[PDB]
Amino acid sequence: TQIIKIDPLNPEIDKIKIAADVIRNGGTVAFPTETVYGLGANAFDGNACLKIFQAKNRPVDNPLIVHIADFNQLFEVAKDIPDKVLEIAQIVWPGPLTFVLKKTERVPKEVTAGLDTVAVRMPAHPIALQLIRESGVPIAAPSANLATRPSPTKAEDVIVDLNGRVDVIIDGGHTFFGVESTIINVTVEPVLLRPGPFTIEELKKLFGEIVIYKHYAPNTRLLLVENRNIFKDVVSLLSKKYKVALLIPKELSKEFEGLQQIILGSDENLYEVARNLFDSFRELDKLNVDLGIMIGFPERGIGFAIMNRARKASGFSIIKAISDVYKYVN
Ligand SMILES: C[C@@H](O)[C@H](NC(=O)OP(=O)(O)OC[C@H]1O[C@@H](n2cnc3c(N)ncnc32)[C@H](O)[C@@H]1O)C(=O)O
Ligand SMILES: [Mg+2]
């Protein structure tokens, strides 16, 4: 694999071209976006897209998102787009919001898992936009992690996972938000399929009527304590019997000094917690602990997405009264 260091805010166009030539030749390129890194191929090339599933060991029926760099490309991959959706797409893109739309005949089965629909977004990241531009094709990509690991948000995550399994990794620094794009299905009348950095507060203003067995990393047991009023007591109860790690904001670090901590960022800046979330799950599994205990965060703004990912990551081990602890541990 060629690892290519490219400045994420002012990318060297000659370096972007090296990766774009790989895309056009049917090869795979991992690249940063504003959400998480993606592992991409030419969205029109179904054999090239199968290489993404081979690199990740991804089940073949989990479909990809097509990333576009302009509106001409939208109409190559999607059709029958309602006028209201088109007008909204023109004000939200580039940005961390993916639309599920009806596909065109040009989109391969490998991209859509055989579905009649295709998920599309225009990524708000200079490296991603310039890669797609220079490639001259939309780029299909899911998150760039190996199957059972958390979505990658910095180059080293992608390197550890995919080095030797993909043609190019673009080392483009840390992604901006750290959690995957919001996904809305606008082929039905519309449903929020995945919360993300494009918040439900903003969505509801644009789409008033919006409707709201996989194992998720980490492999270490992880409990999510939604009720902050019992957190100290859940930690007391469990740290007596287990070697624990606490996933907490920096404001609670002093209260638990002596226990292993993974600091997610500041309670006064949820974007920091979202930026650090998946890497805190990688750290948990590097440590040698019986279990992770994460505290909840407000479900406002990107909080909703943080908590969506945290619930999944915990296998829905949610603690709202301390007696809930019974259900998940001796
Ligand atoms: C690279 C960056 O753009 C990142 N992509 C990513 O994280 O994709 P990822 O979540 O691994 O895979 C694409 C997901 O997008 C959803 N998806 C794709 N096509 C769909 C369709 N036609 N209907 C419903 N959901 C779809 C599925 O949940 C599928 O698992 C992101 O969305 O921010
Ligand atoms: Mg993924």
Swiss-Prot record:
Cell location: Cytoplasm
A GO biological process held by the record: regulation of translational fidelity
Keywords associated with the record: ATP-binding, Cytoplasm, Nucleotide-binding, Nucleotidyltransferase, Transferase, tRNA processing
Stretch forming the signal peptide: none
A single GO cellular-component term on record: cytoplasm
EC assignment: 2.7.7.87
SUPFAM superfamilies recorded: YrdC/RibB
Catalytic activity annotation: L-threonine + hydrogencarbonate + ATP = L-threonylcarbamoyladenylate + diphosphate + H2O
Keyword GTP-binding: no
UniProt enzyme class: transferase
Binding site for ATP: 58, 62, 117, 143, 151, 194, 216
Annotated binding of L-threonine, by residue: 35, 67, 121, 141, 181
Residue ranges annotated for the YrdC-like domain, each copy included: 13-198
Major localization listed first in the record, in broad terms: cytoplasm
Single GO MF annotation: ATP binding
Domain of life: Archaea
Function: Required for the formation of a threonylcarbamoyl group on adenosine at position 37 (t(6)A37) in tRNAs that read codons beginning with adenine. Probably catalyzes the conversion of L-threonine, HCO(3)(-)/CO(2) and ATP to give threonylcarbamoyl-AMP (TC-AMP) as the acyladenylate intermediate, with the release of diphosphate. Shows ATP hydrolysis activity in vitro, producing AMP.
Assembly notes: Monomer.
Family assignment from sequence similarity: Belongs to the SUA5 family.
Protein name: Threonylcarbamoyl-AMP synthase
Highest classification ranks of the organism: Archaea, Thermoproteota, Thermoprotei, Sulfolobales, Sulfolobaceae
